[PDB]
Amino acid sequence: ADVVTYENKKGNVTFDHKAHAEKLGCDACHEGTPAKIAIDKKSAHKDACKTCHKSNNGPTKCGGCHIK
Ligand code: HEC
Ligand code: HEC
Numbered sequence: 624a625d626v627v628t629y630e631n632k633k634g635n636v637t638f639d640h641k642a643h644a645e646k647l648g649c650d651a652c653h654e655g656t657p658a659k660i661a662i663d664k665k666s667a668h669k670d671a672c673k674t675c676h677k678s679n680n681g682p683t684k685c686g687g688c689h690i691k
């Protein structure tokens with residue numbers, strides 16, 4: 624939408640949608656027609672959030688995405 628959170632026992636991940644859309648484009652996460660994704664811990668840590676977020680900010684194990 625514009626912002627969503629993936630709630631999880633860990634520490635609810637609030638993820639930029641709007642922001643990431645304007646700064647990055649769309650391509651970032653959706654090539655063709657969007658609809659949803661559902662980024663789970665798997666994809667998230669593997670090839671969704673993480674693949675961009677490889678060498679972004681100072682690494683600090685976690686914290687980057689989970690507000691926990
Ligand atoms: C990665 C950082 C994203 C960017 C950049 C954009 N979108 Fe996205 N979108 C993303 C996810 C993870 C999801 C699913 C949310 C969930 O709860 O699993 C979505 C979903 C949409 C949807 C479906 C309706 C909704 O969930 O709001 C649409 C219509 C959509 N996205 C469109 C869209 C467009 C047009 C963007 C580029 C201009 C865009 N998204 C960027 C992740 C990301
Ligand atoms: C590469 C195209 C990206 C993808 C895919 C995701 N993120 Fe991202 N993120 C990206 C950049 C370049 C930035 C900086 C934005 C700016 O305008 O400066 C970010 C930042 C965030 C943040 C804030 C981090 C901070 O420094 O406070 C969050 C919370 C965040 N991103 C979360 C996030 C999640 C959970 C994603 C997967 C759904 C994700 N991002 C993908 C670039 C990219």
Ligand code: HEC
Nearest residue numbers: 629631633636662663664667672673676684685686687688
């Ligand atoms: C953004 C680049 C992230 C960083 C930094 C870390 N995590 Fe993450 N995680 C992220 C997302 C978008 C999601 C998907 C939503 C979901 O809840 O599946 C996750 C998910 C997890 C989970 C899920 C809960 C569970 O399986 O118990 C866990 C365990 C988790 N993340 C832990 C975790 C830790 C310990 C981190 C530092 C080593 C960490 N995450 C960083 C996004 C991001």
